[PDB]
C-alpha cells in the first residue's frame, strides 16, 4: 500500500505514487499547435494519477519537431492549457507540463521559415520524426540535417525555457518538467556523441551540462526550485543517441549538480523499455546519495518493481506510460488488482477521440 500513499513533490502533494508519464499523442490543432477540449477530457479522465506529466510541449516555434505536438509560447496555447489544468484540479488532480526543444529530432518543414532545425552540432540525428500527411494523420519521416547553434543564440534558448516556465505558471500548471532526455536538445548537449562543440558548451562534462543547468537556474529564478522537475535518460541509447563512453560518471555529475539546487524531482527514463540492461542497485544508491529530492522511475515498470524500489528507498514514485493510455482509472485498477484494458497502438498518434478518450473505466 506504499504506492497509494501521498508524496510531496515540490510545492504540491501528489495523492499517490502512481504517476502518468509524458505521452506525446499528436492531436493538437495545426496551425498554432493549440491544445484542444478533447485533450482536456483526455487529461481529466486520468486525474486520479498522483501527478500527471503532460505530453511534451514546445517552448517556442523553433522547438517544434513533431507535427501535432502542442506548444505553450502563444497566448492561445496558454489559454487552452489553462482550461486543461483547471479541469484536472477540479477532480483533485495535479499536473506538470513537460517543456522540450526537439533540437535535431525535427523536420525543416515544421521550422520557422522552413529552415534547418538547430542542435549543438551539425550532426544528423539518424532517426525519424512524425509529420502529418495529406489526410492529417501521423507519418514518420527522416529528420533534417540540423544547424549548429551559434554561441550568440544560447541565451535565447535559455530565455525560451524561462518564458515557457512563466507561461506554465500562467496556464495553471503545478510543476514544470524540463525534457533533458530521449535525444532532444538538452540531451544533445549532454551527450558526447551529439555534442562536438569546442566552446564552453562542449568537451568536458561541466561544459556539456552547462546549458541544462543554465535552464534549471533560470527556472529557479523565474518560479522556484520547488516548481522545477527534470527528466533525464543518462544511461543507454534513446532514439539513436547514446550517452557516451563515460555515461555512469557523467550521469552522477549532472545528478549531483541538480541535487545541490534542491529541485522538485528527478524523473529517470531507464533503459529497460528502450531495450537495455536495467540499473543496478549500486547505481541507484549512487543516484540517491547525490539527489535528495523525490526520484521518479519510469520505463518497463510493474507494480512489483515499483514497490520493491520504493521499499528500498531507491525511488519515491513510478511513472507509467502505455498503461495510462489505455486505462483512465489505472490507480483504481492497480489497487483492486483488476485487469487492464488492452492497448490500441494504432491510435496512439494522431486521429481523434478513438484510442484517446474512449477507453472505459472499471
Ligand atoms: C505514445 C507514447 C508517447 C510518448 N511521449 C513522450 C514525451 O512526450 N516525452 C517523454 O519524455 N517521453 C515520452 N514517451 C516515453 C514515456 O514517457 C515513458 O518513458 C515510457 O512510455 C514509460 O514506459 P512504459 O510505457 O512501459 O510505462 C512516450 C511513450 C509512448 C508509448
From Swiss-Prot:
GO terms for molecular function: FMN binding; N-ethylmaleimide reductase activity; oxidoreductase activity, acting on other nitrogenous compounds as donors, with NAD or NADP as acceptor. Disruption phenotype: Mutant is still able to grow and use TNT as the sole nitrogen source. Deletion of the gene increases the HOCl sensitivity. Mutant shows no defect in survival of methylglyoxal stress. InterPro entries: Aldolase_TIM (IPR013785), OxRdtase_FMN_N (IPR001155), Oye-like (IPR045247). It catalyses: N-ethylmaleimide + NADPH + H(+) = N-ethylsuccinimide + NADP(+). It comes from the Bacteria. Its cofactor is FMN. Keywords: Flavoprotein, FMN, NADP, Oxidoreductase. GO terms for cellular component: cytosol. The keyword Ribosomal protein does not apply. Induction: Repressed by NemR. Induced by N-ethylmaleimide and reactive electrophilic species (RES) such as quinones, glyoxals and methylglyoxal. Up-regulated by HOCl. GO terms for biological process: 2,4,6-trinitrotoluene catabolic process; nitroglycerin metabolic process; xenobiotic metabolic process. The active site is at residue 184. It is an enzyme of class 1 (oxidoreductase). Its EC number is 1.3.1.-. FMN binds at residues 98, 231, 321-322. Belongs to the NADH:flavin oxidoreductase/NADH oxidase family. Involved in the degradation of toxic compounds. Can use a variety of substrates, including the nitrate ester explosives glycerol trinitrate (GTN) and pentaerythritol tetranitrate (PETN), chromate and various electrophiles such as quinones. Involved in resistance to hypochlorous acid (HOCl), which is the active component of household bleach and a powerful antimicrobial during the innate immune response. Catalyzes the reduction of N-ethylmaleimide (NEM) to N-ethylsuccinimide. Together with NfsA and NfsB, can use the nitroaromatic explosive 2,4,6-trinitrotoluene (TNT). This is N-ethylmaleimide reductase. It comes from Escherichia coli (strain K12). The gene is nemA.
Amino acid at each position: 500500500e506504499k504506492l497509494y500513499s501521498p508524496l510531496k513533490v515540490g510545492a504540491i502533494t501528489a495523492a499517490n505514487r502512481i504517476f502518468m508519464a509524458p505521452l506525446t499523442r499528436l492531436r493538437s490543432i495545426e496551425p498554432g499547435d493549440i491544445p484542444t477540449p478533447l485533450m482536456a477530457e483526455y487529461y481529466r479522465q486520468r486525474a486520479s494519477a498522483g501527478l500527471i506529466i503532460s505530453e511534451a510541449t514546445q517552448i517556442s516555434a523553433q522547438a517544434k519537431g513533431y507535427a501535432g505536438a502542442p506548444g505553450i509560447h502563444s497566448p492561445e496555447q496558454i489559454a487552452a492549457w489553462k482550461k486543461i489544468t483547471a479541469g484536472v484540479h477540479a477532480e483533485n488532480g495535479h499536473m506538470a507540463v513537460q517543456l522540450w526543444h526537439t533540437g535535431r529530432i525535427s523536420h525543416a518543414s515544421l521550422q520557422p521559415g522552413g529552415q534547418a532545425p538547430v542542435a549543438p552540432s551539425a550532426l544528423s540525428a539518424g532517426t525519424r520524426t512524425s509529420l502529418r500527411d495529406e489526410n492529417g494523420q501521423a507519418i514518420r519521416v527522416e529528420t533534417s540535417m540540423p544547424r549548429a547553434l551559434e554561441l550568440e543564440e544560447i541565451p535565447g534558448i535559455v530565455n525560451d525555457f524561462r518564458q515557457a516556465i512563466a507561461n506554465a505558471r500562467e496556464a495553471g500548471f503545478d510543476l514544470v518538467e524540463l525534457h533533458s532526455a530521449h535525444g532532444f536538445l538538452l540531451h544533445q548537449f549532454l551527450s558526447p556523441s551529439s555534442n562536438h562543440r569546442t566552446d564552453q558548451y562542449g568537451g568536458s562534462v561541466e561544459n556539456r551540462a552547462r546549458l541544462v543547468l543554465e535552464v534549471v537556474d533560470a527556472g529557479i529564478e523565474e518560479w522556484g526550485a520547488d516548481r522545477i522537475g527534470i527528466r533525464v535518460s543518462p544511461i543507454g541509447t534513446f532514439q539513436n543517441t547514446d550517452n557516451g563512453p563515460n555515461e555512469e560518471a557523467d550521469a552522477l555529475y549532472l545528478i549531483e549538480q541538480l541535487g545541490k539546487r534542491g529541485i522538485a524531482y528527478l524523473h529517470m527514463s531507464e533503459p529497460d523499455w528502450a531495450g537495455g540492461e536495467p540499473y543496478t542497485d549500486a547505481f541507484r544508491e549512487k543516484v540517491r546519495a547525490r539527489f535528495h529530492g523525490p526520484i521518479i522511475g519510469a520505463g518497463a515498470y510493474t507494480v512489483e518493481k515499483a514497490e520493491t524500489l520504493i521499499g528500498k528507498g531507491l525511488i519515491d514514485a513510478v511513472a507509467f506510460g502505455r498503461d495510462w493510455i489505455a486505462n483512465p482509472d489505472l490507480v483504481a485498477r492497480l489497487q483492486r488488482k483488476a485487469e487492464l484494458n488492452p492497448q490500441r497502438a494504432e491510435s496512439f498518434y494522431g486521429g481523434g477521440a478513438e484510442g484517446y478518450t474512449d477507453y472505459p473505466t472499471l
